[PDB]
Design a protein around this ligand. Structure first.
Ligand SMILES: C=C1[C@@]2(C)C[C@H]3[C@]4(C)CC[C@@H](O)C(C)(C)[C@H]4CC[C@]3(C)[C@]1(C(=O)OC)C(=O)[C@@](C)(O)C2=O
Ligand SMILES: C=C1[C@@]2(C)C[C@H]3[C@]4(C)CC[C@@H](O)C(C)(C)[C@H]4CC[C@]3(C)[C@]1(C(=O)OC)C(=O)[C@@](C)(O)C2=O
Ligand SMILES: O=C(O)CCC(=O)C(=O)O
Ligand SMILES: O=C(O)CCC(=O)C(=O)O
Ligand SMILES: [Fe+3]
Ligand SMILES: [Fe+3]
Lengths: 295, 293
């Protein structure tokens, strides 16, 4: 920023080799932070090829205002992609960051997966409605910035992110506004005056975003760029996933998963303390016994 | 009644033939209400007999809210009366919708648990607690918070003050600050007047996640005090039981669609301009992949 200019909201950046407490401090202060090279170079390539057939079989709606107008969405990444199920979801850093946002000492893994979405904003797609992802859990806004974190997003780029192909518009620091509202002219005072920043990103980068950060896919201005992303939506264990992964992901794949990844997809329980109780358990036991996964 | 005797809080009681609006009005005022005859005596007695082998095989722990209390949750597997008729209580669904379901979204609730709770002779009293402490952030929203959880807590065997009927605190869903009930955080600690849910078999009380309560002390030598807790949460919250993974598909196929939704064999659509199936499969109902039409 040239001297005397207005400084736009800060969007720090870290290489995927940086410390967890470091990237977390940026997450805490600004609600978001980029992690360049979150997934390896060829890894993202091997992922993008693997889901390209499934993407290719998704028609595009040309409608209207909603978040599906010229935007393809696809969630069966575990089924359709070995690289994702074998490599990406086993990022030690990802878990290291989920432990800081969600887990409490002695209570095990405090988080699990909400969704695994590939989102490909088609050329000419209108800008997505501005929103907090925690609107998925409607009461959460009511708790304001003091509320605990329900949701974080590792929002990784598949094809590159530019200002023109509709990369995500971020509003850093909107996690600390004093009243969390929906973002429209009737409910949001600051509507029309919201300073957004685009998340310019190369394939394999990601931004870790809080469910409190206002954001949205921008308008894709191009004519050939299908702007593709991979969203790793991770929630606290007490919240329900939008994807019923433990009913769609075949048991064969769950047997190949780690313990922690079995916990992420609901093939394994976790114990909550208050008295104690396995959430998503089976009459006082881990659901994994009944599924043939303890041995 | 009593003789200038201090009068205890009133737990309102309605027969199961009362209008769901009259029971919901009581529930809103007090946070709890008794539904007499929520289940028929014939239904209760078949249920109790159908789970009873499973109850006998459960070792009593003697030493914590599991102290001399049996807790059994495979009600759907062990009991046809449960899955074929207790689950199909229309008054239960009337009341659940009035609490949880939003306009134009389908069912906004599902099952958290189906727990048989048999308080043994001599079992000590349970700590005072709100059931929404299961979702730890919920107390922070206070009494203006939305409902997260309700309990249809049914007497399977009689509930008496001696054998440990639940102690309830009506209107504790309206206190300005929702706190955990200990000496550090709860200013009223020790000073809280509870009342027991005196119930006959098949009766039940409907209770908010926001009401303070605990199982009473079982001061008898003979009464094993058996209850059935139908714990119902809203659709965005995680169940304590993984029913869709343990309940067999053969039993899912025989369920009504609203029962399939209760146990996670079927999705429900939430609206935010946008629409998403909660607990879905790549934009489609999970009931498709499961073969439930
Ligand atoms: C761990 C416990 C938790 C936190 C949650 C409950 C809870 C899921 C709360 C909601 C209810 O609708 C119902 C009946 C389904 C219970 C069953 C018993 C447990 C699982 C619990 C327990 O089993 O304690 C050894 C408790 O007794 C208790 C009361 O103290 C708790 O509040
Ligand atoms: C219905 C929608 C909901 C309500 C919820 C999200 C949500 C599950 C929220 C949490 C995120 O981590 C992520 C990326 C996984 C998305 C995926 C897209 C949808 C499912 C949604 C959508 O697909 O719109 C027809 C939207 O785009 C949106 C933003 O507008 C919504 O708020
Ligand atoms: O497509 C994008 O860039 C953002 C996706 C998103 O924010 C959502 O669907 O919740
Ligand atoms: O068994 C009772 O009467 C009380 C049980 C209860 O409130 C609980 O475990 O949450
Ligand atoms: Fe979003
Ligand atoms: Fe309770």
């Amino acid at each position: 920023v040239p001297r005397g200019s207005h400084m736009p909201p800060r969007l720090q950046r870290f290489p995927a080799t940086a410390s967890a407490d470091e990237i977390f401090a940026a997450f805490q202060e600004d609600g978001c932070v980029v992690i360049e090279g979150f997934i390896s170079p060829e890894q993202v390539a091997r992922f993008s090829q693997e889901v390209d057939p499934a993407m290719e079989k998704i028609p595009v709606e040309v409608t209207n205002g909603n978040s599906n107008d010229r935007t393809k969405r696809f969630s069966k990444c575990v089924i359709a992609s070995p690289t994702f199920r074998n490599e990406i979801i086993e990022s030690d850093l990802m878990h290291e960051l989920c432990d800081r946002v969600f887990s409490k000492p002695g209570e095990g893994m405090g988080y699990h997966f909400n969704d695994n979405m590939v989102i490909e904003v088609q050329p000419g797609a209108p800008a997505q409605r501005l929103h907090r992802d925690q609107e998925l859990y409607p009461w959460w806004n009511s708790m304001g910035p003091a509320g605990p974190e329900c949701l974080i997003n590792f929002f990784c780029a598949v094809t590159p992110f530019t200002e023109e192909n509709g990369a995500t518009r971020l509003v850093p620091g909107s996690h600390l506004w004093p009243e969390f509202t929906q973002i429209n002219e009737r409910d949001c005072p600051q509507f029309g005056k919201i300073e957004t920043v685009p998340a310019i990103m190369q394939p394999g980068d990601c931004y870790l975003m809080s469910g409190k950060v206002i954001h949205g896919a921008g308008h894709n201005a191009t004519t050939t760029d299908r702007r593709r992303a991979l969203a790793l939506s991770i929630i606290r264990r007490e919240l329900r996933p939008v994807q019923a992964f433990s009913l769609s992901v075949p048991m064969k794949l769950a047997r190949e998963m780690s313990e922690r990844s079995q916990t992420m997809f609901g093939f394994r329980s976790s114990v909550q303390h208050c008295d104690m109780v396995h959430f998503w358990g089976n009459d006082g036991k881990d659901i994994a016994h009944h599924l043939g996964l303890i041995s």
